[PDB]
Amino acid sequence: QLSYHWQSTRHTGSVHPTDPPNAIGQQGQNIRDINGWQWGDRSDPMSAATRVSNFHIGYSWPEWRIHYGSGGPAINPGAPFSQAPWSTDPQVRLTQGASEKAIFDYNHGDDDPAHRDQWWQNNLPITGQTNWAPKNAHQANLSSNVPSRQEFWTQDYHNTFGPFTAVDDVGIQYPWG
Amino acid sequence: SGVGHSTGNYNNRTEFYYHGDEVTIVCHSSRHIHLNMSESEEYKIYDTDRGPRFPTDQTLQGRDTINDSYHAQVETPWFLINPNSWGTWMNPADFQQLTTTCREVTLEHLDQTLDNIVIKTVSKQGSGAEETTQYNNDLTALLQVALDKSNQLPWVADNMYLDSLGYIPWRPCKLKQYSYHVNFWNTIDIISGPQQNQWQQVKKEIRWDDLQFTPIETTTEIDLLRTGDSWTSGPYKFNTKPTQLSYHWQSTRHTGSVHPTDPPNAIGQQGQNIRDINGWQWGDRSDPMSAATRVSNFHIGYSWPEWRIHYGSGGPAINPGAPFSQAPWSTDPQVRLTQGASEKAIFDYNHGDDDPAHRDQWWQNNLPITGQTNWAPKNAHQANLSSNVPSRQEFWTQDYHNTFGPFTAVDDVGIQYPWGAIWTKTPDTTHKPMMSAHAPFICKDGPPGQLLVKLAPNYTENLQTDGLGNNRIVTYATFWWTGKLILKGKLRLPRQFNLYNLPGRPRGTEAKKFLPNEIGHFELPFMPGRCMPNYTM
Amino acid sequence: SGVGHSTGNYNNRTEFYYHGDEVTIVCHSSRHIHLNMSESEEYKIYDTDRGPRFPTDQTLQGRDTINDSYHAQVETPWFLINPNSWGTWMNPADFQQLTTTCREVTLEHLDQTLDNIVIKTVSKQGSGAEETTQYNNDLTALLQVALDKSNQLPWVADNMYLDSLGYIPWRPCKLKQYSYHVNFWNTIDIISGPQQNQWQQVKKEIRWDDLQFTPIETTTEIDLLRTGDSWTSGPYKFNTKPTQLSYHWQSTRHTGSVHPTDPPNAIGQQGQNIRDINGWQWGDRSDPMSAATRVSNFHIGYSWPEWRIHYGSGGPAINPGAPFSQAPWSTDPQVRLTQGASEKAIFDYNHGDDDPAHRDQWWQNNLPITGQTNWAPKNAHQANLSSNVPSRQEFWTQDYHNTFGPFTAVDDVGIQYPWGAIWTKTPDTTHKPMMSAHAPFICKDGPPGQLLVKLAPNYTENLQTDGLGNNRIVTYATFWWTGKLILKGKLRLPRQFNLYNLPGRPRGTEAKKFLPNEIGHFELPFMPGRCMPNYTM
Amino acid sequence: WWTGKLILKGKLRLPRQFNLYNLPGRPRGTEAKKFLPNEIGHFELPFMPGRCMPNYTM
Amino acid sequence: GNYNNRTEFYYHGDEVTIVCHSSRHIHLNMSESEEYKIYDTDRGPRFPTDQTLQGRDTI
């Protein structure tokens, strides 16, 4: 594929019912009492986050997994995605989208002989499969009630690849790939 | 047809044809549609608020950020006609017939028409006291019809908000405006602050530099129809796979060779597991030859960080685990165990609730599907599997790992009769999903084209650029949608000696609930779609 | 079609077809047109006032007489449907596609239709307080359509006032009345009085003895259409030349043989022009062998008394010099250098401004076109060209002469995407113009015929000769224009090793400006039409 | 001298939207001179993404 | 043989054909030995000699 995909699960399918804004500064207003399919036993808060979907875009992963096989440690790669939605400070470099780095030289497209050049490929356009493991959570039940402090977990680092998952590969990386 | 000739008739019959092992189900559906004038003639792009219940503070430590509805969309003057839901095509007795006589079913063909277009304008004479309303036919007014057959438009016809045509043939249907998401970022950090117990917004905005805007008029050709005019979609052919009409009760402990047992000798006695036997066992385990450590070829079901919350770009979303019944763990019926990837349909009068002005709801917990039951917190793992029992360390519980793997066999949810979607579009990504979390049929090529309709604007004599709905005669339309959906099943024949439990209404329900009352209100029953036991192996 | 059958459909798609070196672009456009009743049924001849800002005195010494709008015209009850503008035929992504994949493009074919005619009358009941307005279909009323295929009518469809059909497919369009100039004299002397610093009118009047009056009814046949009726133009075939989709950066100093140079030896060093060389030089100049005095075969660009004001019969008019970029002379971005024959489009909501009630404007300065840059005040001429530098006398600056001549090579402006005209009529004179100052295509034979429409008068029961609009039932119409414009391009393939700058929005603009906002307002971007560098020689 | 011939088969890309695309070009923070020969003939090749343009997933 | 580094594009309908010609001038020295050799290596730069980083640098 020569295209990048911006759609996450929240970008796909039916849009949450909204009444339009009436003027230039106004935002749409999510409708409160609506019908639909929701996950678990959840009807009171009809919300886009708990809307059922057919598939799921992207998966989480123990990012920068180090395998340590026979023959030594090796990176077990997670899926490629952009960290641009989480970035904020451009000084700190978030490497976790399975980004790659090409180190190259004069014959491979560096300008200066005797010094190697390098390009960090962070995959900035690929969003919507963005899946930073530490930012996820899981809860015991999904209902009209908010779970307590226990019953809610963060920073798990599980692999969420499964039979419902749709995910893109990195694609062509032109000079060095 | 001119003005005084009908352009079509009404067929809501379902027809069954049995030949050999093959059954052909022809579903005719006809609906009378009420269409108003579009609230504006403009395409609009805007984002929204968070929606009800999203936190304003850290009282719940961001656990309630799962309530986020934030999104950005491109409003479109067009209305969507979506027949993607069982109930729009089959009444309860028809679907009962389907799930009684068929072991599996596939989609084969879809045809659609629109006809008998009536467009009226409303006139209001007199002042408030003697205000009189006149409804006049506008014989030259136009209805606009766009069918996107090439699937060039964003696909939003998944029925997840139950936008589908209504389920009961004698009531009128209304339509929802077509809208789709644009590119936005909705990143929320739930581990922000010291102690990592605070939620903070990271990026919430529309991505204009990247945004995609695809109006109907420049993407598809549009048919213009007057009152004597009719419209047909032409044939659509499904390319999909059959869905199973059975539920599977077999776990890994129910499958394959049975542990050697000597029979009981009398009525109250139980079988006695044989002690010294041969066989294959996992690890280096021979002394305790036991069914639990018997080797198997495959594994039924997988565990999962159940009710996984993803928090992607665009906000949190449930990453669904596999469907299964919590009935084996239930005990107390008061507590509701939601963890089998259960779903809940919230619906209304046109979608099968009895009372107008109040919505009804059905919690689909998938009680028959056991044996892929895999509640994460109940599992364990141990360092070694041997004749020795591992110590306290070397044994772990309550892990919440994903156990999906190359040896895994697992069922999808199957048809959910009244409210469930029928088909779904395949996402265009490098790795296509292996199975669907809700819709039983995945269209390998494009799904049926989205049928979009809009009443052409009927202007007053003074057309001002500053005006919106002022220079627009108040106009509405009624017309008739008809459709034909062909299904192909395989016949179901008895595989057992004893009696089956045949499909019927849900357990705790009485027939009167699904029958018209004094004023004509009734509900449609949930029907499982995997209604009967079958062997997995 | 009778009364309840549509006479046409809606296609706004643009289609691209690539075969070998040839590209075929099929532009479908459909517009919903709102037409009122003509303000009078009479042809009128009248002249005007001077217009805003024309001097009443000698405060500015007549320099502000350039503000003259005076003219005489023959008002005509007819309305013009003019599709002569990019934007009426192509959306921004389509035109981006065109200018990315095509090195040049020609016009090939034009087809037009009118259909789905709706004619309504307005009734007003009750006194002011309870005044109620009724809109009734008049099923027997007539629309008049005249296409002048023989070009017997004065051609006024040049889009210079932006009278063209609107650019965004989902909005309605209104039409301007057809009118054309009659013979008048508007001579203003700007060197009048002692000191020759005073402006005085010489002749300002209509030339009745010579005047030409050509009404529609006696010049062309007229089609009469009721609501069930449709109209087609038939095929029109363009005879024109291709327009270049590239901009040229090469001046005479950029072309041909390079001055002999020895290379730099290291990163900070510059080449060193060789001193003693052979070659051809202008005049008797050999000692200073220099690139400036190198002989060439041709000369790129010409100078001109820039912003020439003609003051003909009928008043002052700009005599345009060649288009070029002032970017090489710019420096301060605050001061705006207008002298490259730059143009300015002033436009409104239907023509691609976002805000109703306020007009927007784009100054087209032609920044990529350099190398024909020829600012008159910066040139010079010298008596002789030799090894000797001429004295103070023998050297002249700031001349403002016209340097167009037989050795001159010069580009026209090219396509100006949103607002620019497409074609133009060739003036019928002994010497045909060599090139066009604005419209990219010059029709060698007649241009597409002017499409004129007028709603037939709907009279009351009492027809009085003294009456005008009293004996005329208030009547308006809506109908649908469709058109098909076929373009033939030549494919653009990379001529260089390095990356091109591909067509996109203008420099200082953000994508949101060209995307619908909350209420649906947006602008269309200017696209240059010469978007990419190419070699001249 | 090595010579080679590699044949690729693509599918054409046509506009799926009304508005303007961002067309492939050099990376964001880079200037064209970096990818052009200098006085002594040294230059770099630009990274090009290979997924360069938005498309709908569903 | 001759030298062709041209890339050629051919557009027909929905199909594009891209023909990439590449030519390279190759410099080849004599092999440093004529023998096949089997050997293992050292750890490489930055691999820990001690437990200062608790083995995090064993990557």
Ligand SMILES: CC(=O)N[C@H]1[C@H]([C@H](O)[C@H](O)CO)O[C@@](O)(C(=O)O)C[C@@H]1O
């Ligand atoms: C080809 C090239 O010049 N690469 C430059 C990269 C890229 O700009 C980024 O890696 C892109 O993500 O930046 C560096 O400083 C770096 O971070 O290693 C090295 C170098 O200056």
Ligand SMILES: CC(=O)N[C@H]1[C@H]([C@H](O)[C@H](O)CO)O[C@@](O)(C(=O)O)C[C@@H]1O
């Ligand atoms: C269609 C219908 O009437 N649904 C009823 C459901 C179902 O009995 C269960 O959800 C099945 O699991 O029960 C409810 O009380 C509920 O829990 O939301 C609502 C409603 O009374």
Ligand SMILES: CC(=O)N[C@H]1[C@H]([C@H](O)[C@H](O)CO)O[C@@](O)(C(=O)O)C[C@@H]1O
């Ligand atoms: C379409 C549009 O928005 N046009 C803008 C122009 C252009 O940026 C320049 O004219 C380009 O040369 O700038 C103005 O301020 C101006 O100078 O008249 C008006 C307006 O803001």
